RNA sequence: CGGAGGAGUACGAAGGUGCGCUCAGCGUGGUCGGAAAUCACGCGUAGAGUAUAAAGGCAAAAGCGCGCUUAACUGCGAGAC
RNA sequence: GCUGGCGACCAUAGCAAGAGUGAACCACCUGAUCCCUUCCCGAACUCAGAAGUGAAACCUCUUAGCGCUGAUGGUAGUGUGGGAUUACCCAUGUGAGAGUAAGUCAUCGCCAGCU
């Protein structure tokens, strides 16, 4: 007999909106377990580190700051 | 050595970042054992809108390093900012305790008529 | 018998053996060496037998460097056991060999003696080999 | 001391070390006393005895020091008091050091107990003296089992020789 | 003086994986010459000539002359690539000296 | 019926907020006190910690303290996964 | 041109060593009355100040010393079509990582004070 054979259900994480797409307020941009990406201008952060848009506009990704973090923002 | 200043900027960082995130005009104040300084800065954080300090010719002949001079500098910055056209600002203590000369400057500005 | 003193995991996937040996194809310790020109597997027993033959031929007059180590475990099913019911038990350890991999080097021995010892050793190995010497570049 | 050091010993040290700037002249910063009374978890009264003792010795309220990290070999663990300590700066350290240099060395059993060695290598000097008497405190009556205290002096003297020079000028026995 | 290598030009249509494999099937060897004050130049050599030159120890310390047409370059051998299993030379670097 | 591990809880503070603080290791000196308790000073360093398994994270620290407290609310909710 | 504050950017920008500045500023500095503070301490936070100093610390300049950046060429991998089956070859498109030549002791904005 074996002692293995367990696994958990999938969680479906990942980027939902890519750069250059238009969004409306409330749209979810990234699903992530930890803060792989950080919230920029017009982007909010949920209690499970989800990133969502707080304005209408166009999504942009970049690398900024002294620690070299990855940021996502919405341009109006 | 140097740890006083490093700690002070470490304490100032959180308030400065929160003010930047809110996007409000900032009233940043600096203190030194001899003088006091105050500036009004745009929300983006790159352009100075107004300034006032004891180095001005009006006060440079006085004590320049106590509560009385802080009140006058607060009145001066309030008047100059009101003339420039800013009304609602967020106060930035830059890691100093909200007390003494800092508090006097803030109170003088509020009395002068900047709502915060 | 060579074997890792400790391992993080007992059993590993089979994998695939492809490519050439860009690392470990240059003589670095001795003056003369034997390298494989064909790909395959080398077991701990084979490594031990080849080392013993080379040492006996060269009469312990020089140093022998072994540059292959068996760190991949291989499992087998107990026998008369049907398919399924989990992975089998570990039986022996092997080292993956890609063409160009140097197996043994010899230092401090005459070239004719070294070639004789390597010729003796090659008859114990499951792949074709060749003899190389140190060069400037 | 105090004015004694400021008016006299400053020039004396300046001429002794031939150092140009007055800010280079060594000065004593702080005095730290410690009792690390371990195994207190078994009894719990020796610790209050010790804090009362140092409160008597020095004119300040001592602070108890808890543990960091847990050692199974000893009976010690993270968040409980293991020792206690006092620090002194300014006039308090000058007065305490004067009382030390004056009245401690006569009342000890064996002289020569202190050395010009035991320098940290940067000008700070630590000495551990057994017994809590040699101070103007109450005698064996009204105190618990006697305890020994460690005292460290921390100064602005850069190196060992300057530390020794300042010590010699102040008048430690060694 | 002692060592002269005859080379041809290697134009842009003769660069890449396929072209290099075709050259080595034709039994030639691609090589690159770089060094101070000038732009790198790509050339091709003969395997037999290269092997003969490498057969001697002094070749790795002397200054050699590579001639392609009328021009001539004075260089030293800087790097060398070999086939892992056959030991045949495959590429060469020359630094201008 | 492939290879490895966890869960069937805990907490009125281990929740909220304002203010404040940096770990771990080593080398030195110093009563019992040593490899290892506590004290002081230097050196390279996130290798510590995060109630609990692992992964993704953590300087505005998401790690660690103190004062006051109950937003561990009621009615909802554009828009998304 | 020097000094202070706030940013842009986040090692070609950093670290380490060496040297320099007190007119102003900055820093060290004096005191503990009053405001305020230490699970002890005017050390830190805070107030009242000007006898001292540029020692420390911060800023500025020099150095390739560590670090960092980094070609060209070749090699590995790979989409499509064909030929083969220890997993490679041909046509066509694409193309690293490591290493080499080489480079680096940053570059800009807003305001205020001095010569």
Swiss-Prot record, chain A:
GO cellular component, one term: cytosolic large ribosomal subunit
UniProt keywords, alphabetically: Ribonucleoprotein, Ribosomal protein
Gene Ontology BP terms: translation
GO function terms (MF aspect): structural constituent of ribosome
Disordered, as annotated region: 1-12
Gene3D superfamilies linked to this entry: 2.40.50.100
Keyword Ribosomal protein: yes
Family: Belongs to the bacterial ribosomal protein bL27 family.
Protein's recorded name: Large ribosomal subunit protein bL27
Species this protein is from: Acinetobacter baumannii (strain AB0057)
High-level lineage: Bacteria, Pseudomonadati, Pseudomonadota, Gammaproteobacteria, Moraxellales
Gene: rpmA
Swiss-Prot record, chain B:
GO molecular function: 5S rRNA binding; structural constituent of ribosome
NCBIfam families per record: L18_bact
Species for this entry: Acinetobacter baumannii (strain AB0057)
CDD domains in alphabetical order: Ribosomal_L18_L5e (cd00432)
Keywords: Ribonucleoprotein, Ribosomal protein, RNA-binding, rRNA-binding
GO aspect biological process, one term: translation
Subunit note: Part of the 50S ribosomal subunit; part of the 5S rRNA/L5/L18/L25 subcomplex. Contacts the 5S and 23S rRNAs.
Protein name: Large ribosomal subunit protein uL18
UniProt key word DNA repair: no
Domain of life: Bacteria
Swiss-Prot record, chain C:
SUPFAM superfamilies according to UniProt: Ribosomal protein L16p/L10e
UniProt GO molecular function: rRNA binding; structural constituent of ribosome; tRNA binding
Keywords: Ribonucleoprotein, Ribosomal protein, RNA-binding, rRNA-binding, tRNA-binding
Gene Ontology terms: biological process: translation
Source species, domain of life: Bacteria
Any one annotated GO CC term: cytosolic large ribosomal subunit
One matching Pfam family: Ribosomal_L16
Annotated function: Binds 23S rRNA and is also seen to make contacts with the A and possibly P site tRNAs.
Classification via NCBIfam families: rplP_bact
Family to which this protein belongs: Belongs to the universal ribosomal protein uL16 family.
Name of the protein in its database record: Large ribosomal subunit protein uL16
Organism: Acinetobacter baumannii (strain AB0057)
Swiss-Prot record, chain D:
One GO BP: translation
Keyword annotations from UniProtKB, A to Z: Ribonucleoprotein, Ribosomal protein, RNA-binding, rRNA-binding, tRNA-binding
Example GO molecular function: tRNA binding
InterPro entries assigned to the protein according to its UniProt record, in alphabetical order: Ribosomal_uL5, Ribosomal_uL5_bac-type, Ribosomal_uL5_C, Ribosomal_uL5_CS, Ribosomal_uL5_dom_sf, Ribosomal_uL5_N
Ribonucleoprotein recorded as keyword: yes
CC terms in the record's Gene Ontology section: ribonucleoprotein complex; ribosome
Pfam families linked to this entry: Ribosomal_L5, Ribosomal_L5_C
Stored PANTHER family: 60S RIBOSOMAL PROTEIN L11-RELATED
Assembly notes: Part of the 50S ribosomal subunit; part of the 5S rRNA/L5/L18/L25 subcomplex. Contacts the 5S rRNA and the P site tRNA. Forms a bridge to the 30S subunit in the 70S ribosome.
Function in brief: This is one of the proteins that bind and probably mediate the attachment of the 5S RNA into the large ribosomal subunit, where it forms part of the central protuberance. In the 70S ribosome it contacts protein S13 of the 30S subunit (bridge B1b), connecting the 2 subunits; this bridge is implicated in subunit movement. Contacts the P site tRNA; the 5S rRNA and some of its associated proteins might help stabilize positioning of ribosome-bound tRNAs.
Family, as annotated: Belongs to the universal ribosomal protein uL5 family.
Protein name as catalogued: Large ribosomal subunit protein uL5
Organism: Acinetobacter baumannii (strain AB0057)
Protein's gene: rplE
């Amino acid at each position: 007999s074996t002692k293995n054979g367990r696994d958990s259900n999938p969680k479906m994480l990942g980027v939902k909106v890519y750069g250059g797409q238009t969004v409306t307020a409330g749209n979810i941009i990234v699903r992530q377990r930890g803060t792989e990406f950080h919230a920029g201008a017009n982007v909010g952060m949920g209690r499970d580190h989800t990133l969502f848009a707080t304005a209408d506009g166009v999504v942009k990704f970049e690398v900024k700051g002294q620690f070299g973090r990855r940021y996502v923002k919405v341009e109006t | 050595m140097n740890e006083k200043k490093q700690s002070r900027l470490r304490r100032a960082k959180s308030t400065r970042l929160h003010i930047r995130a809110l996007g409000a005009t900032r009233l940043c104040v600096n203190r030194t054992p001899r003088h006091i300084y105050a500036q009004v800065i745009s929300a983006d954080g790159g352009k100075v809108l107004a300034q006032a300090s004891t180095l001005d010719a009006s006060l440079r002949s006085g004590t320049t390093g106590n509560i009385e001079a802080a009140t006058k500098v607060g009145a001066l910055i309030a008047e100059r900012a009101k003339a420039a056209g800013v009304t609602k600002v967020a106060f930035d203590r830059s890691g100093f305790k909200y007390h003494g000369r800092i508090k006097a400057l803030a109170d003088a500005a509020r009395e002068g008529g900047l709502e915060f | 018998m060579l074997q890792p003193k400790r391992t993080k995991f007992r059993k590993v996937h089979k994998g695939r053996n492809t490519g050439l040996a860009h690392r470990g194809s240059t003589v670095s310790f001795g003056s003369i060496a034997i390298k494989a020109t064909e790909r395959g597997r080398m077991t701990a027993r084979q490594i031990e037998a080849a080392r013993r033959t080379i040492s006996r031929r060269i009469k312990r007059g020089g140093k022998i460097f072994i540059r292959v180590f068996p760190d991949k475990p291989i499992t087998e099913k107990p026998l008369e056991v049907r398919m399924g019911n989990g992975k089998g038990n570990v039986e022996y350890w092997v080292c993956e060999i890609k063409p160009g991999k140097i197996l043994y080097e010899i230092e401090g021995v005459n070239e004719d003696l070294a070639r004789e010892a390597f010729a003796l050793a090659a008859a114990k190995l499951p792949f074709k080999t060749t003899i190389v010497t140190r060069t400037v570049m | 001391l105090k004015a004694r050091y400021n008016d006299e010993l400053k020039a004396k040290l300046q001429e002794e070390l031939s150092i140009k700037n007055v800010m280079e002249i060594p000065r004593i910063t702080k005095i730290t006393l410690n009792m690390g009374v371990g195994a207190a978890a078994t009894d719990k009264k020796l610790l209050d005895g010790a804090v009362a003792d140092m409160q008597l010795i020095a004119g300040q309220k001592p602070v108890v020091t808890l543990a960091r990290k847990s050692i199974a070999g000893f009976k010690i663990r993270d968040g409980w008091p293991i020792g206690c300590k006092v620090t002194l700066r300014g006039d308090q350290m000058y007065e305490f050091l004067d009382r030390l240099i004056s009245i401690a060395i006569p009342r000890i059993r064996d002289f020569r107990g202190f050395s010009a060695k035991s320098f940290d290598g940067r000008g700070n000097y630590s000495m551990g003296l057994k017994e809590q008497i040699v101070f103007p405190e109450i005698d064996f009556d009204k105190i618990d089992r006697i305890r020994g205290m460690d005292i460290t002096i921390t100064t602005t003297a850069r190196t060992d020789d300057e530390g020794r020079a300042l010590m010699r000028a102040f008048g430690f026995p060694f | 003086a002692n060592f002269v290598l005859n080379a041809q030009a290697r134009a842009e249509d003769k660069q890449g994986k396929g072209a290099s494999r075709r050259l080595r099937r034709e039994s030639l060897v691609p090589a690159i010459i770089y060094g101070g004050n000038a732009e790198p130049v790509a050339v091709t050599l003969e395997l037999r000539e290269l092997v003969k030159a490498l057969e001697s120890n002094v070749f790795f310390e002397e200054v050699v002359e590579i001639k392609v047409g009328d021009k001539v370059e004075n260089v030293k051998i800087q790097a060398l690539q070999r086939h892992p299993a056959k030991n045949t030379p495959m590429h060469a670097d020359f630094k201008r000296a």
